[PDB]
Amino acid sequence: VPDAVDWREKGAVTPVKDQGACGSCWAFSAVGNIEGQWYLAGHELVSLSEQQLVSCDDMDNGCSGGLMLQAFDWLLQNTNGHLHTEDSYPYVSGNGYVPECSNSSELVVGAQIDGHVLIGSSEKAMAAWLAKNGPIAIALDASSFMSYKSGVLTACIGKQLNHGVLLVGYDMTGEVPYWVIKNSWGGDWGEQGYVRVVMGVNACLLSEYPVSAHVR
């Protein structure tokens, strides 16, 4: 069990994105995880398309919510696991409206998944899984994120799962051990788009729904 893991420094995390007023956290969470699994399977890091899921995934509900596992299922059942690049299928739902799904010939496939896993809902198991396998898509209570600016959150409201984000690392070398979370509220929010949360107390209910795609 390493004292610290940072998948950002290891090259597995793309720049921070901004979901805007759309309830598409589920798509940002899922895509961020896919980006990491894709890189860790030996491919070049590439930013992938949340918009494809928001507009095309009919198991989920666009700007009205979704679930990361359902997003993976939609890809597996409808595109043979293929996801387009962000550059070719950019995010346009920041104002809450969802355009029709595109099948333009200018779309470029950026990645392919072949399965998914639901990781045991235990913080200690998540840390071991993340240390070996990469960033985890999680659900949590983000109520305490509304006022967060910087530092390690040691008091998180843990009442209701109301957001989805990406767990990119942890560090246990200081007095307060912490997880590092990539949010989808733009690079000006929090610590250049990230938040740190204490480990070992199920802070923010972060161990309730840890999931990942699988890449060959």
Catalytic center residues: 25, 163, 183
Helices marked H in 79-199 — which ranges?
123-133
Q: Which of 50, 60, 123, 141 binds ligand GES (CB under 6 A)?
A: 60
Q: CA–CA separation, 137 vs 135, rounded Å?
A: 7
- Angstrom CA distances, 148 to 19, 62, 173, stand at 18, 27, 22
Q: Which C-beta is closer to ligand GES: that of 95 or that of 173? A: 95
Q: Around Cβ 123, how many Cβ atoms within 10 Å? A: 18
| 24 is a contact residue toward ligand GES (CB under 6 A) | yes
- Report in angstroms how near the CB of residue 139 gets to ligand GES at its nearest: 4
Q: Which of 65, 177, 186, 187 binds ligand GES (CB under 6 A)?
A: 65
| 67 is a contact residue toward ligand GES (CB under 6 A) | yes
Question: How far does Cα 199 stand from its chain's mean position?
Answer: 18
∠ CA 11-195-211, nearest 5°, is: 65
Tell me the three state secondary structure of residue 32: helix
**Could you tell me which of 174, 171, 167, 173 has the C-alpha nearest to residue 194?**
167
Q: Which among 60-68, 124-132, 173-181, 194-202 is the span making contact with ligand GES, rule CB under 6 A?
A: 60-68
| 62 is a contact residue toward ligand GES (CB under 6 A) | no
Size of the site for ligand GES (CB under 6 A): 17
| 161 is a contact residue toward ligand GES (CB under 6 A) | yes
Window 94-113: contact mask with ligand GES (x via CB under 6 A): --------------------
By CB under 6 A, name the binding residues for ligand GES: 23-26, 60-61, 64-67, 70, 139, 161-164, 209
